[PDB]
Symmetry: D4
Subunit: 210 residues, 8 copies
């Protein structure tokens, strides 16, 4: 019975050293050391760990100690997302979908599906971005966009709720109502959505005053 024991202990040692390298790295990043943080996260992600791959991608696309790169960054994000990390797949989808390119390529469908199943978890940013993405060409699906924008806005995001308000006012996906749109704009401006909410409130409060 010692063979399974030794296999178990060596696999546990592998996993534990991965954990320790990741924890070290994040402690260095929080403390202030960065190049050592990059080295630690790279050598931790080289051996198949989820959070390590996420942080490697995060530091390698923010470039907090390495020139700004996206290719290897999104490769790390893919490798982390395949293992079931919510933030990793959110970042992967947001980085791959930043272009206005068409959705004919299958990797776009894969990215939007993984972002969808990420937003199913409950992360605030993923579902808000999904609601934004499904509202614009060529991902037009008004009902799902509305429902996820509303669900994200219920968590307290000002911009998502302003987008819900413009969705009501423009009358796409939801019946064209104006009073709820006005109160939504007012509360979004109250919650400190400076640019868009302030601009729309000022326009509506000046069109009849100028």
């Amino acid at each position: 019975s010692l063979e399974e024991a030794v296999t178990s202990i060596q696999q546990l040692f592998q996993l534990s050293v991965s954990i320790a390298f990741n924890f070290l790295g994040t402690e260095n990043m929080k403390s202030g050391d960065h190049t050592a943080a990059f080295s630690y996260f790279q050598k931790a992600a080289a051996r198949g760990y989820s959070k390590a791959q996420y942080n490697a991608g995060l530091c390698h696309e923010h470039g907090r100690g390495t020139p700004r790169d996206i290719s290897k960054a999104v490769l790390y994000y893919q490798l982390a997302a395949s293992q079931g990390h919510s933030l990793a797949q959110y970042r992967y989808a947001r980085c791959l979908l930043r272009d206005p390119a068409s959705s004919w390529n299958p990797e776009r469908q894969r990215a939007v599906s993984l972002l969808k199943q990420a937003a199913d978890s409950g992360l605030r940013e993923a579902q808000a971005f999904l609601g934004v993405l499904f509202t614009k060409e060529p991902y037009l699906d008004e009902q799902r966009a509305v429902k996820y924008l509303w669900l994200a806005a219920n968590n307290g995001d000002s911009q998502s709720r302003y987008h819900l308000g413009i969705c009501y006012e423009k009358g796409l996906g939801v019946q064209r109502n104006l009073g709820e749109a006005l109160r939504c704009y007012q509360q979004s401006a109250a919650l400190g959505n400076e640019a868009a909410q302030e601009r729309l409130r000022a326009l509506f409060s000046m069109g009849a005053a100028a």
Copy 2:
């Protein structure tokens, strides 16, 4: 007892002939004969009757059977208003004050005071007219304007309550509120105020169109 009896009976004869002539006149006007109605109303008003003076002024200012005249119309309206006919004094004030002339003369102040007294009697039009009046130079009194505009709007006038809404959104006399103004615009659209809705709803919907 014969002297008081004969005085009473002759005064009754005067009042009865006044009533009969006014009646006849209004029956002729309703039936379709007009010049006879004019003559009847003039000879009824020449002998001191309130409603007869109102009808004479009305038929002189609309001119529905006599060339348009404002001088005699306004004089007859003055005679009718001095005796306590609410609609007559409303018409007097509206016809005399329709000019954009200054209110330095006290006679205009007398006209606006009698308009106030007429509106205090419950007439729908006088209240709305003074609500419009007090918002324009030099009759600036915002609180009274708002209160009587609201009182007239409670009777169901679309224009008066649209002016209440414009007052809310512009924030004069009342704290500057937008949601109540929007619902007021919407309900004024519901009652069919063409000039109000067909401009305000279009201006608040032009923002939706891109």
Copy 3:
């Protein structure tokens, strides 16, 4: 001064005998005598009296003691409506618009215009009639129909308010609101709309509880 006096007294005699004929006819109708009511109303309406012509038309189109007739009834209703009687012109439009024939004749436009400027006075039935009429071909004007149906239903008519409810539910002229339509149906059935509100409640109950 005798010529104007004699003309005035003979006009007064004419109008007063018309009044007497009308009053005696309506008293006979209320008491129970009917053929005398026809005779009196006809001889009163033959000499140019508004309410007398209304009653003549009413007794000719209900036929409460004379065979049912339309041509004489509609002619009397036209003659009475020309003189400014709200009920007269309401009944004229009711009896003229009841046919399913084409509206190429301008008399139909005249009838709808007089119905409109009748219902603008405040009569309950004319408003509901025009609200129904403008909803059907070829008088399609959704906004006016909705507004007058609403201000008619505000007076407490169950059928007009049920028609407002179906207007909301079907989403013609107003945005397709559904909860308001359900509440309107329910409180129409509360006021005793025996047929319509009850049958929609039953249809949405039996076909909803399965």
Copy 4:
């Protein structure tokens, strides 16, 4: 002295090796290796651990690397539930109650009791499932079913609140209300109940459309 120390250290060693094997197994399952995860979970559950027994039951009922089995799955689920694991006992009850068999067998009595005391903890799924279960024969207990459906739907489940709405509409256990039921259907369709709420909305649409 030393005897209690050695007993404590050996018991701690047994517990720690159980913990390590469970952690290993779940790390392998998350990473992607499966058969090793099955072996690890099996040998961890063979020595009396709660979460390990739950994971063994889960991997035997989904069969993500082992032929589908319910017998061993439910045995492991029972062994995990007896030790106080909320999600495991929820799974046990939902697996044992999937059959349409009667509740004469007292194993069903313990199953429903353990599901009840699991839902008392606050898990979303168990409460909704029991709310569904108590509605159908022979578990009829309307008040408790409605209360647990309501408090489960308060957590944001679309199907639970849709079933609350159908409970309102059919009026079983709750006073028959219809407007709030319609609002509940509408919001559940808004929250993304793609099948059921949308189907009832369409039914209430085509009910009057055709």
Copy 5:
């Protein structure tokens, strides 16, 4: 010509003497003389007049100067009701239906029908009495009773709306709702329905703070 004119003038004289006799009767009743009121009203009702018959019935059933008599009052109310007097027919129905007898006698059929078509006119008391009567054996029609109780209570009658509240809380005709019944009792106490509303509030306080 002569014959129709003389018939018209003699019928007018009959009507005018009836009017005068009724006017003297009501003037005497208001002034304070009562036996002359009985004489005038009796001789006025003896010649076929509506409100004269109503007043004769009123003075016979109150006996404001004549021994209490119901048979003559009931006959006079019948004569007044047959001629189309809303208040008189309401009085007839309420006087005839005071007995707890069944509705097998068709006299009760006419009584209830005329009370129905009187309450349809807009009188306050008739509606409330019908709402009460349809609630009690053998006139049980819950929906009609509820709808007239509500319509009468809308006019501001305190006792009718207290009956509406008792009907709602007892759950006949309308489903059992409690909060609305609670502030229905509260407003009925506020509007001065001292007896019933005070009793219900006192009971609801004694059984609560016991």
Copy 6:
């Protein structure tokens, strides 16, 4: 039949001459002649007419053409109120209850009873006056005062509704509620009440910085 006929015709002559005297009095008062109006009103009121006695009391207590007198005024008001005139008895209460004397004299009880049966008719001012009166010593009856203040304020009187607000905030007769009291103050001051505005702005607006 000559005796009853002559009695009827002479009584009709008495009533008709009273009506004529009152009509000439009111026509002269409206026209502008005052002493003749006084003479006619006294000679009409001396011979048993209700409205004439009201007008005589009114012209004696305002003194619009005769030196101020209260004795004759209140005597005429008593005679007019004994016959069932709402305004007459309300003015009797006006002129009698103004004294700060005690209510030991039963004539005060008669005055308040006639005021009660006046307010039961539906006049606006009498109810507001009794609502003020029952609040102050020794007429303390809080419930009735509140109920009739509320019912009168429902008619739109600003002072009565401000008194309703003071009653709410002070917590006499009603539960001491502040939010409804603040609102009530707000719309009372909105309708142009000097006292309500001067109380609100000095209590809940000045106390902030004073």
Copy 7:
């Protein structure tokens, strides 16, 4: 140098053996072994650990494997509460306040103070218990009792909100409101207050049923 190191390592060893014994003990209790759990918890609490002392108190007051004792239970609870354990101090206060003895003994003063500062943390049970406690003699402090009952019931406790409802009806510490109290009773019965809310609903049912 080495001296501080050896002191630190020996103190860490004491703390770690305490932690391990506590963890062991709770693992044995959850697994099913009890007397070993008692021994482990006893020897862990004998050396000054907070959670171990709480568990010792719990196992001495429930007696799930040791004869029931309150003396040692409350002594352990005090020793755990002095170190800052919220649930332990809640248990101490609830065990010491179960007697109906007076608060003359200052041990009750510390007990109530520690319960207060425990409830200040946010535990549901302690706040509800103090809300119950301050209502009854001699701990009468109505405002604080109501506020803590309200904020505890906001967490979803049925009995706490039922006691809030009673507080509303009896009107102690809060302005006596009845409609909101009825709604609170109804919702608490809906949330599953099987005994008390249902009993009051039945009482308010049979109060009018019989």
Copy 8:
């Protein structure tokens, strides 16, 4: 591989001994030993650890075992804040900015910026304190103050709710609403904001009802 391994293991040892020293420090603080807690926290913070520095600052500024000092306290707070400790950076900002001096010194700008980015994290006290901060000279920026007071009051802080109410009633930053301000006062007094809310309720009670 020896050099990277030895560097990793030595860095891990340094971090682990820092963790252990902090753990024994907090264990001593909770147990009751204080001077040892001070020594351990100081030697842990001397080697660069975040929450150890926070605890050192806390023990120097409360002085729970050392004479009161702010200098070393704020230096340790700066060291902890620079490393990303939300609560520590709150404490640093609040301790540095307690002085009433101006914001000319850049250290105040740094403190307010770090407090801003602390409040943006989600800490309850930071947002409330910053809402208070921006209200007073020279940090006047009303919108941010209003939004942070609103968000903090949404978390249940009574004083923040009172300051929101004072902001509404005083009409700075938000429109001068008074009704919802009174409701805010009342329901903040319900939560137990004894001093200020009780003071305002007493001022609005004595000045109004006395």
